[PDB]
Every structure is written in structure tokens, then in C-alpha cells.
Design a protein around this ligand. Structure first.
Ligand SMILES: Cc1cc2nc3c(=O)[nH]c(=O)nc-3n(C[C@H](O)[C@H](O)[C@H](O)COP(=O)(O)O)c2cc1C
Ligand SMILES: Cc1cc2nc3c(=O)[nH]c(=O)nc-3n(C[C@H](O)[C@H](O)[C@H](O)COP(=O)(O)O)c2cc1C
Ligand SMILES: Cc1cc2nc3c(=O)[nH]c(=O)nc-3n(C[C@H](O)[C@H](O)[C@H](O)COP(=O)(O)O)c2cc1C
Ligand SMILES: Cc1cc2nc3c(=O)[nH]c(=O)nc-3n(C[C@H](O)[C@H](O)[C@H](O)COP(=O)(O)O)c2cc1C
Ligand SMILES: Cc1cc2nc3c(=O)[nH]c(=O)nc-3n(C[C@H](O)[C@H](O)[C@H](O)COP(=O)(O)O)c2cc1C
Ligand SMILES: Cc1cc2nc3c(=O)[nH]c(=O)nc-3n(C[C@H](O)[C@H](O)[C@H](O)COP(=O)(O)O)c2cc1C
Ligand SMILES: Cc1cc2nc3c(=O)[nH]c(=O)nc-3n(C[C@H](O)[C@H](O)[C@H](O)COP(=O)(O)O)c2cc1C
Ligand SMILES: Cc1cc2nc3c(=O)[nH]c(=O)nc-3n(C[C@H](O)[C@H](O)[C@H](O)COP(=O)(O)O)c2cc1C
Ligand SMILES: Cc1cc2nc3c(=O)[nH]c(=O)nc-3n(C[C@H](O)[C@H](O)[C@H](O)COP(=O)(O)O)c2cc1C
Lengths: 183, 182, 186, 186, 170, 189, 183, 182, 183
């Protein structure tokens, strides 16, 4: 029974976080989830709800703890098998690359780097400027896994859901879990 | 009319290049297409065809010119925009180094040399420090770094919807009106 | 049974590849071997043969798969497929250069680039002398990206007698890094 | 007798390599020549032959050995065989890039990398215009590693009249770098 | 009628003469700035090299006197050095600096060989700040016959970057 | 007669220093030799003697001067005209010291002197694997003009014995010194 | 049983090395200990003894091997290497690769073999020169663990502060120990 | 009365250290002196003595305290300035690296750490790129880099005139008034 | 007969240039001498004369050619170039590539052709800006040779110190001269 921290930042593609958290729980693990106010908006615009938990089957709720973005005092903010920021806005990328650990989402990423525990970042921004590429580079040189949501067309997806599933499968493979989402 | 150069490199997502060349042809423009041998393989694994032109409406073919990857002597290697789509990280690395030793890499080098639009659509994951360093260098030298990332706020339903919206973003950066843009 | 990728680049010392692949098979493992055209020439000039398989005892051949240098579509070329460690032995400065730049445009360079981006073990056995500033910068950059830089340095405190002893003990160090127990290790 | 290696890469100005090799042979020296496939095409479009030897007096052919571009096993591929200087002329930016990376995966690139590692003279005659930041960075790195960067720029204070005058003066400056006495120097 | 600045830095003044007069033949205005180093003859005045009917279109400036594009041709390494440092302390240098400061075209035609690491670093820095680095490379696949052919094709390369049309462009 | 400095640093392969010094003296040259305390240990472990001079034919001793590692006042610690300086073998620690300019014993000083006078310095560094820290020091030294010559065996010369491999490595050193020695071999076809 | 190397360099806080070794031995492990000459001075000024082993319960002495600092040829020269306390001079040497005594050598071997290396550097203020060396060592895999007091554990005594600092070392070694405390 | 630290490193020019310490004591100041083993050798070769105090008038000895090089414990390890003179490139290298593993290197490190004056009088010729980088690094961290350059515009006649005016330059940097400054 | 360029920049120590030129001429060599306007005044202050040639023996004048700092000249192949003394302004100009007078050009030509360039900079203290310029020139092949007295030769007179410094220059020139003494 592994323990994961999933930080959800306000970039497009919150379905990726929904799918990842569902599958992590369906495989029996524990997830601490931190939703930023911008991801809260993205949740409404992209998935038509204001409750992240309503997107997750109810029997898995005892495996998910929501933490408020301001709780830098929380016990995730100080053991954890991996931390995943998905989706990850370039503003959150910039903060983590600076060390600017002044909310809980940014703190859990800094803690993963400080303890050399896995930190997977799923940035979504296009086009990518030189400023953002330099922050991404700096994070990769400090051991962050940089995993943009790149569709895998040789699995010949038919639906949008297929494309999301295969992207989450790649996150799970980086996490070294066996999931049927991995092709 | 406008003239475009589309280099197709051996990353996943050839459907993106099909869609782009198809729409550019449909708008009345000319496209010089350069297909790498790796892209020729990906064309088979992803679109179950060994002929690139068999995926474009036959009426458009008089607007498309296929160039062999080794024709470094070619006329395009001396104009409106150059698009490498999809773009492997090996081809990213070659362009970032200036290693213009085939026709695809040379048309990219020429765009950077002349300050003409170069759009790269790199696809790889994860992206290591080596590839990010190459990406950064190209962005600093004026290349538009446009990874094919799905636009979920358009609420796509099909895989084809996702490819169409990605290509719409390329068309928008080329500042062309197109139904593929939202 | 573990799975290993062995890239054979055209530097001097192909005997190192031969004895490494042979020992990996003898311990029961599976080896995917990628031979560059230059290493194919070095095999001839150094081992007087044109067939790499001809240097491996025959019962081991079922555990070895040869892959063409151009087969970038190979299943070993995907990160999805789990490899225990990738060894480029011997490794030319040309291939060091390509890997350090990200120039993953043949299968040998690609399997090395795949191990880097997946943070799986990549052992390079570079052989060149002298080492120029340009080579040392490429090696430095690969070490900073997690590759193990293992030049084939003779181990003289094992008091070798024959040229084969020097080679065996170099391969013993590769096997030590791989976390394997082997009679080649001292 | 001194021994030179001349690498001919696919940039414009193949006449410079003809003139240099002819003069080096006239002066009695030995020249190993490596013509890339792109330079073969430039030879036809600029000098209307497909045979580099045809542009040199036949009485000098005994001082010249042509090597295929893929022949990285050639004697001039090793640092053990002493070369007095290596000249890449003309030099495309693709080849500058390869040499600046250490990408020694053909004989022309290998020849240049061997000069840098042995610290023997390497003269590059790069031709491209304009020069982008990417290309200038490669040139810079090569100059910092000891390469002589000699772009083929006309020497107008000699008041050339003909195109051949300009080519001859430029080759004169290479020979001056080689510290060779020659009537093409002024 | 466009307005071009041609700065003549201290070998290869034939390139500047060829550019200025072709710009003039195309109906444009040229502000020429000649360094003392470039004034150092086989002719006394630079205006004597341009056809006289073009003279109303050309204005000479003293280099010690405190716009579509700026071309420095030929361009010495000291002038490259000064511009790359921001050392805008004569008229030639500060008109180059103005073009870099306003993101206007600056075409540099350096004629030094060999190029040492110090000069390459200055060129690189200028390229990274948007200057066009255009060394005078003969084009050869045009099969030039005279020295005059080679000069004209080099100037045609300048005009092409200026996005002008001219029979010098081949 | 040329004049050489051989520094013997405490890494594996002291047979390389024995072979080089012997061949330099056979050619008729003079060698100032400096042996670190670590190399003295390695001499014992690898060659089973505590006397470096016992490994060299006695008729050559008149061409060889041993210097104590702490004699920074020695004649060879001053930029006296030396034709080449070789540290063989060369530990990564000594590489580190030289690359920092930490010229606080005679072996490191002799290397610093070669660098400041732009006279040849050959380093025969031996260590495996090489970390990023060591690669960076090696890089720095190469950019400052040191020849970085790790003792890579030369298998295209089809060696049969350990001695063959050592001899060919020393032959590569002699080829960089631009000396004409039978230990040097050259590539063929 | 695991095997540890504890290098003791001449910085203030030698109590930290006493505590770490005692507890590692109490858990059943083997410790090779290297004391620099300056740490022997520090041991005298701070703990009033010239015998490191006089500070360790005698039943643990069979698990401890003391090495001389000049024994560069030692068999040590496996599970983790801790330099505690670590002087800035030792930080400087290790960051340079100046592996010219046994203490500097075992740290360099840890970095070369990519085994754990924990440095407990003690110096204040930290100049730019020392920060640069610390940065380099962190970028090459070393764990940089300055002996920062953990005040939210509300210590009463100086011993409390030393125990919690060692407990953090133990946590990084992924050992379980009654010195460790959870926030 | 002010307090100075004078480290004597093993480069040529130990007369400068003798002249400096003796003049600081003549002004009534206190000097802690640290002599490296190498400087002990150069004392012998350059000044025909094996006792540093023998070069100083005996009446000033009560203001001078000698410290062993290995004595990294010491109250010197409140100080008005620290002067390493002469300073070998090896000592420059150690200080630039933070290799504070003897008392001379340590007092220099302490001055840098506390932002107190550190004057280095390095003596070596030529200065290689390695030495210049270390010098640069030290200047960037606030050390004063004072190579012992003869002041010819004072028209010296003797070797002692040259050494005196060099020390006068140190004294000036120390903000002291002395007849050694012209 | 070798051919030297000696550039005389405006800094203290022109006696070094005087005794270098006369020793080069005494050995039978040819010297092109370039004297800056600032060096001419230092010549009168330090040597009590307006005429550089009045400090050189008249038998040597036929081996010396004086060039004006403002001149197109032919020194724009040489066995070596020495800038002695070398002011910080001259060092800065050469390190920037600012080759806009004959003295700067001759130094630039030496670097471009990879021929010996010896700089004798005389500034104390050396600021970070000046050390950076010096560093850049040493990396580009220039020999940085400050006039450092050689006290282990136990000089007695000011001229002794000056002659031994020029001896070091002559050693770097690989000239066998009786001004050179050896350790
Ligand atoms: C629907 C929606 C989608 C967004 N998508 C992205 C995106 O894909 N990439 C990005 O950089 N910002 C995106 N943004 C803007 C980010 O929310 C913005 O940078 C924000 O301040 C980041 O906040 P956070 O990272 O703390 O959650 C999006 C905003 C909205 C409302
Ligand atoms: C089916 C298939 C999919 C591939 N997808 C990618 C990819 O997404 N990204 C990548 O960098 N390489 C990918 N490759 C490998 C590249 O094609 C390979 O590195 C090649 O040498 C690049 O050459 P090119 O860029 O000239 O086409 C793929 C290969 C195959 C066969
Ligand atoms: C017999 C032989 C030995 C060689 N040894 C080396 C070597 O030790 N190091 C090296 O960098 N190149 C060596 N080469 C040259 C390389 O083969 C050449 O750089 C080649 O292009 C590298 O290709 P690869 O890395 O793709 O195999 C050798 C070539 C031959 C024929
Ligand atoms: C006629 C002709 C002239 C060329 N001139 C140049 C040139 O001047 N500079 C350049 O970078 N490439 C030039 N190229 C293209 C290069 O050949 C191309 O970059 C090639 O891949 C370089 O390969 P190579 O240097 O190994 O021959 C030219 C090509 C042709 C057909
Ligand atoms: C005949 C002659 C030709 C010259 N050619 C060049 C040249 O080709 N490249 C260069 O950098 N300097 C050349 N110079 C010297 C430059 O003019 C020198 O760098 C000058 O000081 C720069 O001043 P300016 O750029 O302000 O004109 C030449 C000088 C003369 C007399
Ligand atoms: C038998 C033996 C072999 C050694 N081999 C090496 C070696 O190959 N590489 C290395 O870096 N250190 C090696 N060492 C350790 C070094 O000698 C150690 O770092 C030493 O302090 C270097 O000192 P020196 O260079 O001043 O002689 C070896 C030690 C011994 C006892
Ligand atoms: C007479 C004599 C003069 C020396 N002069 C210098 C010198 O001028 N510069 C230098 O860097 N080293 C010089 N050295 C050698 C240094 O003492 C040597 O590098 C030493 O290891 C540095 O130790 P230290 O600076 O800690 O005293 C000299 C040695 C002697 C015997
Ligand atoms: C009682 C005492 C306490 C010390 N504390 C420190 C310290 O906290 N930090 C430090 O960098 N040096 C400290 N030192 C000085 C170091 O021991 C000195 O820098 C030495 O050169 C480092 O030696 P090492 O190789 O054992 O690390 C202390 C010395 C003494 C005597
Ligand atoms: C009497 C006198 C002595 C000078 N001494 C020096 C000196 O020792 N070092 C220095 O950098 N500048 C010195 N200068 C000032 C420089 O000459 C000044 O920077 C000058 O403008 C540089 O020009 P030049 O070196 O090309 O002649 C001195 C000036 C004068 C009047």
C-alpha cells in the first residue's frame, strides 16, 4: 500500500488528474490531493463540476485526503512514495524551479526534491517560451521527471478518453506500477 | 498563395502532418514535403499505409512536392514558414547543433539562418535534461517550440478532435484562417 | 533472468563486449546486442572474424538477439519495455558525442538515450587516447545526466599475466556495477 | 616530404580544395584526400567533373591517396600516423557542427577530431552566409579548442582582377598558415 | 524611397562602393559614414566612385559628429568589438547601437581571417542581439569569372537581405 | 640528451612509470623522478619492492635523480628548462590538486610549472568509474593545455601478455614526447 | 547487519558523531570510523576525552573499527558514508575531488560508486566560497544535512537537540530508531 | 593599537614580510605571524637566516606572536587586517577553494567569512589561466589582490628601495601613515 | 636574426622596455618598437629623456624601427610580440578585440596568428574587472608576465631587479641570453 501526493495545478487537462487518482485508488493506494484555486476553476470549465470527489467513485474516498492549498502546516508538507503535479501550469513550474515553496502544492514538490523522492511534473503549455524551457531544464537537472501530456498515436486511439488513458498510463509506468492503463 | 515546407520526422503523430498538409492544400497553398525514413516507418505503424500521398485527397497532389531526405542540393534548401511535424528529439538535437546534414535538418537551419518562421512540434516523454537543453537553445534562436499537447477546454470527444485542435494551433501561429481553429 | 542491452560501438576492445555478453549469458540472462558497422570492422581486425555470434559459445545463442543498427522501430527502442541495464562497450567518442547531444538517430544511440530519459542504468565504456577537451566535456555532461563513465582501465593490483586477464578484470568491474556475482569479479 | 590530410566538404568553393591540393603536391608533399558525398555534387556543379583527380595534373597523382568517406578504418583515422596538418576546405556548417560536437562518425569528421586530440594543426575554411548564432557558437568553440578558423574572404588589397586571382590569394593564406613557401603567397 | 545607413569601417571598400551606388540606382537615399581608417586610396574622394547623378541622394557624415536599415561594410574587427560592447562613442558606433536598441536591421560585413576566439565571441554576441553577420563569402556556384563578378554577387546577397529586388541578385 | 620529469602518483599501474623511465634513459636522456608516499605503497603492492631504482638497470642510475615529494626548493620546482613532464600513473587526487593550482608538494608543483611555462605536461590518469567531479577537473586541465592520456589498452595491436599492454601504452607516451622508440607501433590497413 | 563509514572531521559538534555511532551499533550494524587529527582536538575540547571509544558503550566496540586518516590503502578505500561533523575544509576537499587522505577518499568513493554520502557541515556564517562547494556536492548526489535544530519537537536540553539531529540522519539512512520523531 | 595577522607563504620576497611586520610593530601595533614550512626555507635562501625574529629588531618582539602552521585551534582562528605576504600560488589556490586546512589558510578563510580585510601579495610569473581564475575568484569575494610590482616612478636606486615602496603600498591600503609611503 | 615587436604602453616600468630592446638588439635581432603617447611622458619622468633611442646604444639603432601608434603599417611574420609595460587600458582593449591603434593591432595579430604575445601588466591592486581581462587573454594564448621581482637572486640595485625581470622575458622568448640566471 503505497502513498502518493497528487498536486493539481490550474492547467488544462484536469481529466488526467481524475484518471490518475482513480487508478491509484483502484490499485489500492492512498492519495493526498491538493487542488489550487485555479485548478478548481479548470475543474468547472473542463469537467462541469465543483467537486473533485464527485468525479471519483465513492468507495475510493476513504483513500483520498483533500488538503487546502494554504496548509503548509500539513503532514504531507514534512513517508511518500511519489509526488505528481498534474496538470502543471508553467507558473507552478516556475515556482518549484525557484524553490518558492510558499503554498502546500509548491511545498510538497520542494520536499520531494529535498528528500530525493520521485517528483513527476506534467506541464501543459504551448508554445513553450525560452523562460519556461529554462525552468523545465533546471527541474530536470535537479531530478524532476518532466512528463508533458504527449499523445501516443501508435496505440491508435479512437476517442479523447483513449488519449487521456494512455497519457496516464505513462505516468503509472514512471511510477513503476502495473496498471492496465499502460500499453 | 503561400509556400510552406513541412518536414515529417520520425516521432509519433504523423496524423498531425497529414492534417496540416491537407488543410494547407485545401486553403490554396503549396507545400514542399520532406519525409524522413523513420517517418516513413511511423507512417506505416500509425496510418497503415506506405504512401504519404494516399492520405491526401488526389485533387490536392498538384500542390505538394515530395523531396528525398538526401536531396541536400534541393531548391528549398536555399519560404513562408517551415514546420517540422511531428519532430523527433533526435532531429531537435541535430537542428539545435546546426547539424544540417540532410534535407530536413537543412531546411530548418535555413529558416533560423534567414529569420523565417520555424515551427517545431517535438514529441517525446519524459523529456530529459539533454532534450530540454536542446529545446531551450532553439527557442532562444527563434524557433517556435510547439509540443502537440491536447487542448481539453475545447472538450474534444474523438482522437481526431484532438489532432484537429493541435493542427488548428499550428494554423493559428501561421496566421491562417481555418475551420480547424477555435 | 534479467534483460540487458549491449551496444557495440567501433572503439578498440571488442573483446570486452565478447566476454561481457558471454558472461551475462552464462549467468542465465537475456542480452539484446546492437552492433554498429564500425564495430563490425573492429571485430574483424581484432578478433579475425566477421560474425559476433561466432565468438559466443553456441548454447548461449538462444539468449542473445542481434538487432540491426537502423532498426529504430525495435521494441528495445521503446521506453515502455523494461530493461535492467544498457551497456555501450566499447564506446567510441563519436557515439559518446551523439548520446551527449541527444542525437538518437540510430538504434544504438537510441537505446542509450532511452535509458537516460527513463533513468535506467546506462554504462558507457569509452576508449580513446588522448582525451581532448571536446571529448571530456561530452563525458562530463553524460555523467551529470546519470550515465556511468567506465573507461577500460587495466587493474594492475590484480597482477595480471596475460592480455586476457586484463580484459576479464575490466569486465568484472562492469559486472560489479551491474550488481551481479560472477567469478570474473575480484 | 610532409604529409597533409585535406577534407573536402559540401560547401561552395571546391576550387579552393583543387588549388590547395595541386599546390601542396607541386611542393612535393603527400596528401590524403577525403571527399564527402555532398562535395562530390559540388564538384560537378562548380567544376563540371565527377572526378576530383581529373582536376589535378596526373604527374602528381602518386602523391595523393583518396579515401572513401565511410572508411573510418583508414590509416589516417588513427593518431599513430603523423600528419603535419589537416585542412577542411571548403567546410560546410554541418561539418563545423559535427566537429564542434566531436561527432567523428565518418572519416572526414574523424580526421578533424584526430587533429584536435593530437594537437596538430587543423584549419577550417567554413563558408556560409549569413552566419547564425548557432553556427558562430560552433566556430567559437572550435577556435577555443585550437582550430584555425579561416573563412574564404577575398583579399582585396591585392587588387585581384579575375576570379582565379581571388581563389589563389585565399589558398595563399592557407599555405601561409602551413608555413609553406609558395608563389601563391604575397 | 527608403533610407539606408552605410558605414565604412577600416579591406574591401569596393563592396561599399558597389552597394551605395546600386542602392542609389534603385532610387533610395544613403547616409554614408567613413572612418578615418577606411579613408586610408587609388582615389581621393569616396564620392568620385559613385556616378555623379546619384550624388544628391548621398550624404557624407564625419565620424566624430555627436531609417530602414544599417549596413557596416566593410566592418573591421575593432568596430565589431566596439558595437558588441556598447561602446557608442563615435557616429558609426552609435548608429549601430541605435539600430540594435530599436530592433532595426543591422547588417555587419566583417572581413577578418583567420577569426580568433575573441572576434568570434563578439560576432556571436552581436548575432544573439539581432545583428545580421554577413561575411563576404564568394558564391562560386554562380561561376564568377572576374573579381568584379564576385563582389557584385556578394552585394546581391546584401540586397536580398534588405528585401530589395536588383539584377545583382542571382 | 633531453631532460624529463616523471612524477609517480599513487594510482595503479606503476609498471608504466618503470617502463617509461627505463626507455627514456635507454634513449640517452635525463630523468628527474618524484614518487609520492602513496606511489611508494603501490610500488610495493604491484611490483613487490620498496625501491623504485631496483626496477631499472643500474647502468641507467647515473641518468636518474630521485627527489623527495616535499622538496619544493628543488631545482626542478623552478621554471630550469625541462623538455616534458609526465605524471604516471596519476591519481584523481593529484589531478584534482593540479587542476586547482594546489602546488603544495614537488609533484604538484612540477605539474604547475609545466602549465605556467607552456611546456608539455602528460597526465596518465587512472580511475574507474569517473565521476562528474573528476571529469570536470580533467576537462579543466585539458583546456589549460595538459595532455590527458588515460592508460587505455590498444587492442588493435593484438597484445598477448600484460607486459605487451603496458609497453604499448608507454609507446603512446613516447609518441607524444615525439621520441623514436621501438616501443611505438602504428596502425596498418 | 549493514556496514557504515563515519568520517569525523574537525568541526564543532563531535557529540553528533558519538550519538550516531552508538545508535548504529545498538541497531546491530558495523561502523568503520575515521577521525581526522582536528576532530581529535575537537573531541578533547568538547567531550573532555582523547578516546573516541571511551564515549561508546563497551559492548559496542566489537562493531567499530577505527582507521588512521593516512591509511589511504585501506579496504574501506558499503551501505552509507556519513561525514559528521564536516568542516568546510573537508567540504572543499571533497567537492574538489582532493581525495588525499582516507576520510576524503571514502567520501569520493561514495560519490564515484553512487552510494549514499551524508555530509553534516557546520560553519556559520557560510561564505559564497563555501556555499559554492556545498552546491557542487549537492549536484553530485551528496546529501547536505547541516545540523539544524528541530525546534517544533520542543527540546529542553542540549542532548535533546543533538538526538533529534541524529534522528534525522537515521531517517535519511532509512533506519528505524527511537531517536526519530514524526511531525 | 591595532591587531594584524601576517601569514608568510612560501613565495619569493620574504623581505616584504620582514619589512611589513617590523614597520607595523614600529607603529605600536600587534602582529600574529604564521610562517609556512616553505617560507621557512625561503627565509633561509633569501635572507641567510633560519630565524624570522632575528630579522626583526629585538625591542619589537613583545608585540609579535608566532603561531605554528598546524595550530588551527587559536584565538586568531578581533583582527584589523590579514595580510598573506608573500603569497604562493598554492596558497592562493587553497584559499580560493576554501581549503582551510592549516592555520594560514584558515585565518584567510576567517577574514573572508567575516568580511574583514584580507590582502594577498601573490608572487608568481608567468600567471597561468589557472592562477588568474583563482585570483579573480578571490577578488570577487573581497580579497585585495596586491602583486608586489616595483613602483618605478619613485626612481628607486637599490633593491631595498623597491621592497620598501612595495610595503608602503600595503601600509597605504591598511590606511596607516608611515614614512615608507612617499 | 629574429624579428620582435615591442609595444610600449603607458605604465610605470619603461626601463623594462629599454633593457629588453637593447638586449634583443645586442643578440643580433630586429625590433619594431611602438611607443604610445602615454609611454613617452613616462619615459621622461622615469628615465629623464624625451628620446627612446637615446637610451639605446647607437650601434643598435640600425636594428630598431620606430612606428607611430597611429599608423596601416606592415606590422599590422614576427617571432614574438611583447607589450611592456602594459597598462590596464591596453589589456582591456586587447581582451575586447578593440584593435584601433597600431599597438592594439599588433597584439591582436599575434593572437590571430597564434604567435607569442607576452604582456607585462603593471597594476596593483588588481580589481576583479582587470583580473577578468587578464584571465581572458591567458585563455586565448597570451603569456601574462607581471614584473615580479626575483628575490632569490638576491639583487642589490634597482637595476639588478630590472635586469632579472627582463631575463625572465628573454627566457619565455627561448633566447639564450646572459641576462638570464637560473635557480
Ligand atoms: C480553463 C483554464 C485552463 C488553463 N490552462 C493553462 C495551461 O494549459 N497552461 C498554463 O500555463 N496556464 C493555464 N491556465 C492559467 C493558469 O491557471 C495560471 O497560470 C494560474 O495562475 C496557475 O495557477 P496554479 O498553478 O497555482 O494552479 C488555465 C486557466 C484556465 C481557467
Ligand atoms: C513507431 C515509432 C514511433 C516513434 N515515436 C517517437 C517519438 O515519439 N519521439 C521520438 O523522439 N522518437 C520516436 N521514434 C524514433 C525516431 O524515429 C528515431 O529516433 C529516429 O532515428 C529519428 O529520426 P528522424 O527524426 O530523422 O525521423 C519512433 C519510432 C517509431 C518506429
Ligand atoms: C580497428 C579500429 C579501432 C578503432 N578504435 C577507436 C577507438 O579506440 N576510439 C575511437 O574513438 N574510435 C576508434 N575507431 C574509429 C571509430 O570506429 C569511428 O570513430 C567510428 O565512426 C565510430 O562509429 P560507432 O561509434 O558508430 O561504432 C577505431 C576504428 C578501427 C577500424
Ligand atoms: C552546390 C552546393 C553548394 C553548397 N554550399 C554550401 C555552403 O556554402 N555552406 C553550407 O553550409 N552548406 C552548403 N551546401 C549544402 C551542404 O552540402 C549540406 O549542409 C551538407 O549536408 C553538408 O555535408 P558535408 O559537409 O559532409 O559535405 C551546398 C550544397 C550544394 C549542392
Ligand atoms: C589596407 C588595410 C586593410 C585592412 N583590412 C582589415 C580587415 O580586412 N579587417 C580588419 O578587421 N581590419 C583591417 N584593417 C585595419 C582596421 O582598419 C583597424 O581594425 C582599424 O583600427 C579599425 O578602425 P575602424 O573600424 O573604426 O575603421 C586594415 C587596415 C588597412 C590599412
Ligand atoms: C594499491 C593501491 C592502488 C590505488 N589505485 C588508485 C587508482 O587507480 N586511482 C586513484 O584515484 N587512486 C588510487 N589509489 C588511492 C590513491 O593513491 C589516493 O587517492 C592517494 O591519496 C593519491 O595520492 P598521490 O596522488 O599524491 O600519490 C590506490 C591506492 C592503493 C593503495
Ligand atoms: C627559494 C624559493 C622561492 C620560491 N618562490 C615561489 C614563488 O615565487 N611563487 C610560488 O608560487 N612558489 C614559490 N616557491 C615554492 C612554494 O614554496 C611551493 O609551491 C610550496 O608548496 C607552497 O607552499 P606555501 O605557499 O603554503 O608556503 C618557492 C620555493 C623556494 C625554495
Ligand atoms: C574546538 C574546535 C572547533 C572547531 N569547529 C569548527 C567548525 O565548527 N567548523 C569549521 O569549519 N572548522 C572548525 N574548526 C577548525 C577545523 O578543524 C579546521 O578548519 C581544520 O583545518 C579542518 O580539519 P579536518 O580535515 O579535520 O576537517 C574547529 C577547531 C577546533 C579546535
Ligand atoms: C606617470 C604615469 C604613470 C602611470 N603608470 C601606470 C601604471 O603603472 N599602470 C597602469 O595601468 N596605468 C598607468 N598610467 C596611466 C595609463 O597610461 C592610462 O591608463 C593610459 O590612458 C593608458 O594608455 P596606454 O597604456 O595605451 O598608453 C600611468 C600614467 C602616468 C602619467
Amino acid at each position: 500500500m503505497k502513498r502518493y501526493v497528487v498536486g493539481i495545478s490550474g492547467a488544462s487537462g484536469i481529466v488526467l488528474a481524475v484518471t490518475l487518482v482513480s487508478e491509484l485508488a483502484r490499485l489500492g493506494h492512498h492519495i493526498d490531493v491538493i487542488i489550487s484555486p485555479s485548478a478548481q476553476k479548470t475543474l468547472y470549465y473542463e469537467l462541469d463540476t465543483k467537486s473533485f470527489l464527485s468525479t471519483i467513485p465513492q468507495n475510493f474516498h476513504n483513500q483520498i485526503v483533500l488538503h487546502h492549498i494554504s496548509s503548509i502546516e500539513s503532514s504531507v508538507s514534512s513517508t511518500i512514495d511519489a509526488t505528481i503535479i498534474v496538470p502543471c501550469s508553467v507558473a507552478t513550474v516556475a515556482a518549484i524551479s525557484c524553490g518558492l515553496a510558499d503554498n502546500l502544492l509548491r511545498r510538497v514538490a520542494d520536499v520531494a526534491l529535498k528528500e530525493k523522492r520521485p517528483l513527476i511534473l506534467v506541464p501543459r503549455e504551448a508554445p513553450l517560451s525560452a523562460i519556461h524551457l529554462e525552468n523545465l531544464l533546471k527541474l530536470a537537472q535537479n531530478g524532476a521527471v518532466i512528463l508533458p501530456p504527449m499523445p501516443i498515436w501508435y496505440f491508435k486511439p479512437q476517442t479523447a478518453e483513449d488519449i487521456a488513458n494512455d497519457i496516464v498510463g505513462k505516468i503509472l509506468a514512471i511510477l513503476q506500477l502495473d496498471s492496465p492503463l499502460i500499453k
